[PDB]
Design a protein around this ligand. Structure first.
Ligand code: LBN
Ligand code: CLR
Ligand code: CLR
Ligand code: CLR
Ligand code: CLR
Ligand code: CLR
Ligand code: ZN
Ligand code: ZN
Ligand code: ZN
Ligand code: ZN
Ligand code: ZN
Lengths: 88, 360, 298, 317, 96
């Protein structure tokens, strides 16, 4: 079962973040940032740009950002679009 | 000996023209929509099917009267029933099969090519994008996923098989081993022949019995000439011709007391406010500034200076003995020439890969 | 005043080369989507594809009917020059076998050998000696082919040197407008030449821009390129990893941007736009001047 | 005289193709036996020799050139009367050898007239346009226009020796050529109302009617800058005065010492002293201006025929 | 940037500043619970979600429709739009 249990550490279980997109979204909903492990591509929002540095290590399947939710990006096939499956 | 057998060159040229027509019509339609994005935008969005229908009508009319397709007639070719004029003429069912091959197969091939080429970038984007839909997703999602899987895995093989079967039938046709130059002509039992004098006479008589035919055949000639003369490329080269420029330039070119002077002469790096080690200009031109000896294997860096190839290679890699001796007591407090031009000290974009081996 | 006896053979060879090229193009289209989704597979195996096509053609055309497609289009056929008389003897099996070996096999093996010699260059004394020997062999063959062509201009019997050595000769087995069309192509050629001469004078880039305007600084989309690559070169070639074709030579930096291109590329664009600034391709800003790259120093 | 202009044009095009292919073979042999520098040194001589060989194995012997064979033409003298050996030899001498000798001798005559005008006693117009006026391209264009109209003598030398073509609305070409020449003259007249280098070792020829190579060429073979000073001002490049060049190897043997030997200190294009040396991507050094003009014409190194992009030429320092 | 505005704060409506094609999804946030995906595309119902939720589009106006509101359906419904890359922007959320 795909579990995504949350320097904030997010540990992914049931899947390998090497082959997914990890999106951090905070709530006071505002999308904080996303990371592609395979290519290392990372992007942020204007508010958190610079002050927040995100990355991830595949060896322990963890993502670091330095309530906050982690979700798994899912790119649809019909009218391809980005959704967030498996919040937290 | 068998006149009325078109050479494979004629058939291949005719097929090239038939393949050139749809992109040309699409480009013209796109331009006209750019002018008026009101009535033609809907047509452009559904171009493929409307071009298929127009081609159906035109090719059907040409098959019934001229005996061959529009471009085939333009080339003096006709389609006969492989097995007297009545016996070899195309019956209505044969006309419909010829329409299916002439219009249906190219239409479907264009649709599949377009779908595959639109999907390819997502296919190569990565594995984050290409996550299969879990079961229970709406039938549309699963159908789209399976369509993409087909386009990515099966379609390349189908395209290869299509073109390789065409190639096999061309090779067989060369020397009367096949009688058909294409597998789909073989399936429908039709063969392209060269129109004779009698066929031309019949066509002319039928025309006489009854301003677009001349205008449509001078458009085909113009399209053929446009693509054979490579006119677009020549005009682009003439327009995008080289500009007469002056030669470039580089910015750099026109006992503790020693250390202060050494820092004074050295150019200070930009990323770090730190001096750069640079060798003095040689006393005489015929000398490598790095090793201060005769230039053996001349090579030029990105700045245009010419050194010995091994000398400058090592200097760029930051392993030349001259650097290490100077870097023994100045670690941190100085910047070696690693990735820099030895003389000017300017950084070099290509590193070592971008060195010119000058053939003196 | 003698009947044509050389142009047929020249046309035969030209048609054979054209045919091999066309079939190779069909194989390229077949391998168009294979290998992912550039040259790719078809360019990697160009020699092997050509060898396979030439072998199939030799079996289907020369071996079976004693005439290359192109020799058959001209009503020619290979004959044994050794056996004289109007009988018009066919070539022997050994003649065809050697013709194939040299034309389909020998060409491929020589191409592979020359490619390998080029690879070994970076070289060993043995590599240098072998390169010298093969350059000598190729020069000897080039001289022989030139002299055989000069003799063919006189007598018109053997078109190639291999044909002369094997004694296989192209002869017409049997008797068995086309000029008006070409004379019309002459007028088409003249008119297109006139257009190519005239359009650059009036200025076709400027008029094309005006016609586009009449008919119809956010970050640019080439920022992903490494600093090695020139954005102008990349755009104009691939209309990533830095290659030899797109690297920046003579790096000049745009005055306001700081982005680096080749001196020629940047200067040519800034001059094409005249006073109006050329929009940068890396950050989208507008550029009206450039300076030699500071090279990461003050 | 019973031959139409288009047939003569096509026959000449095919003859030019075969002469060019022979010249290409000879230049390739020259480059195999000796370096590419010597092959490029004798490119024009090799082309003339290839044309002379082609016309010495076909015409000089009374046979028909391959171009004539294609178009079903017979070269008669005014078939009813084939030309004699003296006529054919004279035509070959006048059509191939004489133009090459005149081309070789023209620079000296141009320099002599240039000095004489420089000593003064409309003349300044002649001085600034002496090279265009004394070149044979425009005389050849005039010959071609007269041929397209009359349809008699493709080359000036076939009229001298009275050689016509016999078998076994194309004045449009002449109209276009006349218009082109008139426009070319007008552009120069309107102003007051570079170097050719010739081709290199290899010249592109083709037998296709739609090739647009040198041989398939009906009309004449033969502003947007800012004076090379304004471009330097825009690019912050200090541009030296015209003629004066940074790093000219003719000033002294110590300008760039690592280039040793008088063979290696002269560019193969302008044959003068290397000034503003610039290395193509392949590594061969020419003057900046010379290789700039060459790659403007043909995007290719004049020596090794490798691809050369005008943007990737590196001046040396 | 793209602004995603939900008029309410049942047929919940939302609008986008520009033309975002059909890339709009809906999430359900329960009090002190993680959001649950409902419709990842404009109308593609996420697996396991009851059929009562439906998504619809009209130009640049998206709508989430619940035919028969259930007692456990109370939550905040969030609209999200993503670009071609993974750049997302959420809405304001609508309480039912
Ligand atoms: C000129 O500018 O463009 C050229 C000529 O333009 C043309 O002449 C096009 C006409 C083609 C018509 C063929 C179909 C005829 C059907 C009649 C049926 C009659 C049947 C009657 C019985 C019912 C074409 O080239 P282009 O458009 O410039 O594109 C070049 C740019 N790209 C493509 C390289 C990007
Ligand atoms: C081993 C001794 C050589 C055996 C004969 C064969 C392999 C050779 C010797 C010289 C070779 C050719 C040398 C150069 C060329 C031009 C190039 O387009 C490839 C083929 C061609 C024309 C060579 C083909 C074969 C070939 C004729
Ligand atoms: C007789 C028909 C076919 C052609 C008529 C126009 C011909 C002669 C062309 C050839 C070169 C042309 C000139 C090229 C250069 C310029 C500058 C530009 O700002 C347009 C005007 C002007 C001055 C053009 C006028 C028209 C021109 C003279
Ligand atoms: C019939 C076709 C093949 C001939 C080509 C059309 C030529 C003649 C057209 C195309 C552009 C035209 C010119 C466009 C603008 C100008 C500026 C004006 O001050 C003089 C005429 C001039 C220079 C046009 C003259 C002709 C002209 C050159
Ligand atoms: C296949 C080639 C070699 C046939 C030779 C005959 C033709 C091409 C002529 C034209 C110009 C001639 C050369 C003119 C000058 C020289 C310099 C010297 O080095 C002697 C030969 C050399 C280099 C000529 C050799 C031949 C030669 C190249
Ligand atoms: C049938 C023959 C005459 C055809 C032409 C032969 C060619 C190879 C001859 C004609 C004129 C000859 C040259 C005449 C004079 C010179 C002087 C010197 O610069 C080197 C050779 C050079 C330049 C001749 C080289 C060859 C050469 C070009
Ligand atoms: Zn050195
Ligand atoms: Zn910029
Ligand atoms: Zn560039
Ligand atoms: Zn020069
Ligand atoms: Zn070179």
């Amino acid at each position: 079962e795909v579990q995504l249990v949350e320097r904030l550490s997010c540990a992914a279980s049931g899947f390998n973040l090497y082959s997914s997109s990890i999106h951090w979204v905070r709530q006071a909903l505002e999308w904080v940032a996303y990371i592609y492990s395979s290519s290392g591509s990372t992007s942020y929002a204007d508010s958190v740009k610079g002050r927040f540095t995100i990355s991830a290590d595949t060896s322990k399947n963890t993502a670091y950002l330095q309530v906050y939710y982690c979700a798994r990006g899912y790119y649809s096939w019909y009218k391809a679009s980005w959704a967030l499956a498996d919040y937290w | 000996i068998d006149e009325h057998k078109p050479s494979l060159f004629e058939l291949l040229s005719e097929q090239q023209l038939a393949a050139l027509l749809p992109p040309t019509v699409r480009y013209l339609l796109t331009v006209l929509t750019q002018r008026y994005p009101r009535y033609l935008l809907r047509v452009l969005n559904s171009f493929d099917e409307l071009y298929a229908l127009a081609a159906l009508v035109v090719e059907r009319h040409y098959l019934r009267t001229r005996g061959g397709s529009f471009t085939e007639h333009f080339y003096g070719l006709k389609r006969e029933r492989a097995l007297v004029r009545d016996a070899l003429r195309l019956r209505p069912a044969d006309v419909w099969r010829n329409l299916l091959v002439i219009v249906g197969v190219p239409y479907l091939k264009r649709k599949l090519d377009e779908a595959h080429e639109a999907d390819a970038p997502r296919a190569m984007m990565g594995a984050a994008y290409n996550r299969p839909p879990l079961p229970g997703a709406p039938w549309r999602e699963r159908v789209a996923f399976w369509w993409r899987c087909f386009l990515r895995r099966v379609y390349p093989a189908v395209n290869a098989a299509y073109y390789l079967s065409i190639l096999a039938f061309n090779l067989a046709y060369l020397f009367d081993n096949s009688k058909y130059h294409s597998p789909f002509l073989c399936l429908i039992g039709t063969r392209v022949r060269r129109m004779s004098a009698a066929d031309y006479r019949a066509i002319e008589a039928l025309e006489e019995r009854a301003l677009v035919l001349p205008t449509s055949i001078f458009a085909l000639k113009f399209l053929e000439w446009w693509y054979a003369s490579d006119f677009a490329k020549q005009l682009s080269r003439k327009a995008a011709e080289s500009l007469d420029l002056p030669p470039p330039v580089v910015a750099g070119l026109p006992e503790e007391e020693k250390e202060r002077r050494a820092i004074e002469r050295a150019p200070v790096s930009a990323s770090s406010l730190l001096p750069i080690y640079t060798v003095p200009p040689p006393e005489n031109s015929d000398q490598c500034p790095i090793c201060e000896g005769e230039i053996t294997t001349a090579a030029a860096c990105q700045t245009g200076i010419v050194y010995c190839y091994p000398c400058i290679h090592k200097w760029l890699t930051g392993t030349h003995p001259r650097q290490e001796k100077f870097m023994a007591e100045r670690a941190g407090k100085w910047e070696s020439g690693e990735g820099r031009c030895a003389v000017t000290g300017r950084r070099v974009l290509g590193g070592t890969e971008g060195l010119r081996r000058i053939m003196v | 005043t003698r009947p044509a006896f050389r142009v047929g053979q020249v046309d035969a060879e030209l048609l054979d080369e054209e045919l091999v090229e066309l079939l190779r193009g069909q194989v390229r289209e077949a391998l168009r989507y294979v290998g992912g989704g550039g040259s790719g597979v078809a360019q990697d195996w160009e020699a092997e594809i050509s060898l396979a096509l030439r072998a199939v053609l030799f079996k289907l055309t020369v071996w079976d009917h004693d005439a290359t497609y192109g020799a058959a289009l001209q009503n020619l056929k290979y004959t044994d020059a050794r056996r004289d008389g109007p009988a018009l003897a066919p070539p022997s099996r050994w003649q065809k076998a050697l013709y194939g070996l040299v034309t389909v096999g020998g060409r491929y093996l020589w191409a592979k050998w020359e490619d390998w010699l080029l690879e070994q260059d970076d070289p060993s004394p043995r590599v240098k000696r072998l390169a010298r020997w093969t350059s000598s062999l190729s020069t000897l063959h080039a001289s022989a082919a030139l002299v055989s062509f000069l003799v063919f201009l006189l007598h018109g019997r053997y078109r190639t040197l291999l044909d002369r050595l094997l004694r296989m000769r192209l002869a017409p087995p049997t008797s068995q407008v086309s000029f008006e069309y070409l004379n019309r192509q002459l007028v088409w050629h003249a008119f297109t030449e006139f257009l190519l001469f005239v359009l650059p004078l009036v200025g076709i880039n400027r008029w094309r821009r005006w016609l586009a305007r009449t008919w119809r600084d956010k970050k640019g989309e080439y920022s992903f390129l490494p600093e090695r690559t020139c954005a102008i070169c990349y755009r104009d070639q691939n209309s990533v990893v830095g290659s030899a074709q797109t690297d920046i030579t003579n790096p000049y930096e745009a005055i306001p941007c700081g982005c680096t291109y080749c001196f020629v590329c940047l200067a040519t664009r800034i001059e094409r736009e005249e006073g109006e600034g050329w929009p940068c391709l890396r950050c989208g800003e507008l550029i009206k001047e450039c300076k030699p790259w500071n090279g990461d120093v003050l | 005289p019973y031959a139409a202009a288009p047939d003569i044009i096509r026959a000449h095009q095919k003859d030019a193709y075969f002469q060019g292919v022979l010249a290409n073979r000879l230049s390739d042999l020259h480059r195999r036996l000796r370096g590419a520098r010597s092959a490029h040194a004798w490119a024009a001589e090799t082309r003339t020799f290839a044309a002379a060989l082609y016309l010495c194995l076909t015409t000089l012997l009374g046979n028909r050139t391959l171009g004539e064979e294609y178009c079903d033409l017979v070269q008669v003298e005014e078939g009813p009367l084939l030309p004699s050996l003296p006529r054919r030899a004279g035509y070959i001498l006048t059509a191939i050898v004489l133009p090459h000798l005149a081309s070789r001798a023209l620079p000296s005559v141009r320099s002599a007239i240039r000095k004489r005008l420089q000593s003064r006693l409309v003349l300044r117009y002649l001085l600034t346009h002496l090279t265009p006026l004394t070149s044979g391209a425009h005389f050849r264009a005039a010959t071609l226009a007269v041929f397209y109209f009359t349809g008699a003598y493709y080359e000036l030398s076939k009229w001298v020796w009275g050689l016509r073509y016999v078998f076994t609305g194309y004045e449009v070409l002449g109209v276009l050529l006349v218009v082109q020449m008139a426009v070319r003259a007008w552009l120069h007249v309107r102003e007051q109302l570079r170097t050719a280098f010739g081709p290199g070792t290899n010249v592109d020829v083709s037998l296709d009617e739609h090739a647009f190579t040198s041989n398939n060429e009906l009309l004449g073979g033969g502003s947007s800058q800012r004076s090379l000073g304004e471009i330097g001002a825009m690019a912050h490049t200090p541009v030296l005065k015209a003629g004066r060049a940074r790093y000219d190897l003719g000033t002294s043997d110590k300008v760039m010492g690592w280039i040793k030997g008088a063979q290696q200190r002269k560019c193969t294009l302008c044959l003068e002293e290397l000034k503003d040396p610039a290395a193509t991507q392949c590594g061969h050094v020419f003057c900046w201006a010379c290789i700039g003009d060459w790659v403007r014409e043909k995007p290719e190194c004049p020596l090794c025929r490798r691809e050369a992009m005008v943007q990737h030429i590196l001046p040396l320092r | 940037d793209i602004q995603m505005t939900q008029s309410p704060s049942v047929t919940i409506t939302c609008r986008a500043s520009q033309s975002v094609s059909s890339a709009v999804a809906w999430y359900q946030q329960k009090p002190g619970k993680a959001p649950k995906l409902l419709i990842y595309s404009a109308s593609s119902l996420y697996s396991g979600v009851p059929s009562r939720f439906s998504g619809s589009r009209s130009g640049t106006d998206f709508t989430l429709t619940i035919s028969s509101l259930q007692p456990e359906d109370f939550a905040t419904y969030y609209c999200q739009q993503g670009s071609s890359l993974g750049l997302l922007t959420f809405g304001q959320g609508t309480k039912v």
